[PDB]
Design a protein around this motif. Structure first.
Motif, PDB file in Angstrom:
ATOM      1  N   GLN A  11     -25.408  28.140  57.358  1.00 20.11           N
ATOM      2  CA  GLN A  11     -24.646  27.393  56.365  1.00 20.11           C
ATOM      3  C   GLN A  11     -24.386  25.967  56.838  1.00 20.11           C
ATOM      4  O   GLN A  11     -24.241  25.715  58.034  1.00 20.11           O
ATOM      5  CB  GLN A  11     -23.318  28.097  56.076  1.00 20.11           C
ATOM      6  N   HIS A  12     -24.330  25.036  55.891  1.00 18.68           N
ATOM      7  CA  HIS A  12     -24.088  23.634  56.210  1.00 18.68           C
ATOM      8  C   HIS A  12     -25.120  23.118  57.208  1.00 18.68           C
ATOM      9  O   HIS A  12     -24.862  22.170  57.951  1.00 18.68           O
ATOM     10  CB  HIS A  12     -22.679  23.453  56.778  1.00 18.68           C
TER      11      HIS A  12
ATOM     12  N   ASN B 215     -28.949  21.875  57.040  1.00 22.44           N
ATOM     13  CA  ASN B 215     -30.166  21.528  56.315  1.00 22.44           C
ATOM     14  C   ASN B 215     -31.110  20.713  57.194  1.00 22.44           C
ATOM     15  O   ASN B 215     -30.924  19.509  57.374  1.00 22.44           O
ATOM     16  CB  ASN B 215     -29.824  20.741  55.048  1.00 22.44           C
TER      17      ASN B 215
ATOM     18  N   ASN C 117     -17.645  22.757  64.899  1.00 25.81           N
ATOM     19  CA  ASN C 117     -17.267  22.023  63.697  1.00 25.81           C
ATOM     20  C   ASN C 117     -18.030  20.705  63.603  1.00 25.81           C
ATOM     21  O   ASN C 117     -18.096  19.945  64.568  1.00 25.81           O
ATOM     22  CB  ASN C 117     -15.761  21.754  63.691  1.00 25.81           C
ATOM     23  N   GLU C 118     -18.603  20.442  62.433  1.00 26.45           N
ATOM     24  CA  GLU C 118     -19.361  19.216  62.212  1.00 26.45           C
ATOM     25  C   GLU C 118     -18.744  18.050  62.978  1.00 26.45           C
ATOM     26  O   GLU C 118     -19.424  17.367  63.744  1.00 26.45           O
ATOM     27  CB  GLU C 118     -19.418  18.887  60.719  1.00 26.45           C
TER      28      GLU C 118
END
Length: 121
Positions: free
Chosen positions: A26-27, A29, A61-62
């Protein structure tokens, strides 16, 4: 590196593998082999995939890009012994890294993982 290469890509095949491994997450790409690994998540995903006890994307976390990178690097240097070409900080700092320096690095993870042939799932 090339001034304006167009038609055939070198890492063409390489990308696939990566995109495949990261596929599903997820998240995450993955479209290239430069910025797609500027946060670290990309790589971390590949690793954790096989050994989640090593990396916990959940915590990754991003925002915590720098850390997300250093983690993978160290882990790879502690288990695989592969020294990081760039520093987590620089990885996130640099907007557009050298696709080359990246491929040469990622490759190690490609061959290290890609071993004996096995029918397609």
């Amino acid at each position: 590196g090339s001034s304006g290469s167009s038609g055939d890509i070198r890492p063409s095949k390489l990308l696939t593998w990566c995109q495949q491994q990261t596929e599903g997450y997820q998240h995450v790409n993955v479209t290239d082999l430069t910025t797609s690994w500027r946060s670290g998540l990309a790589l971390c995903a590949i690793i954790h995939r096989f050994r989640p006890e090593l990396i916990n994307f959940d915590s990754l976390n991003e925002d915590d890009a720098v850390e997300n990178n250093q983690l993978a690097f160290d882990v790879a240097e502690r288990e695989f012994g592969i020294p990081p070409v760039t520093t987590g900080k620089e990885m996130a700092s640099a907007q557009e890294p050298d696709k080359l320096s990246m491929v040469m690095y990622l490759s190690k993870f490609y061959e290290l993982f890609r071993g004996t042939p096995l029918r397609p799932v």
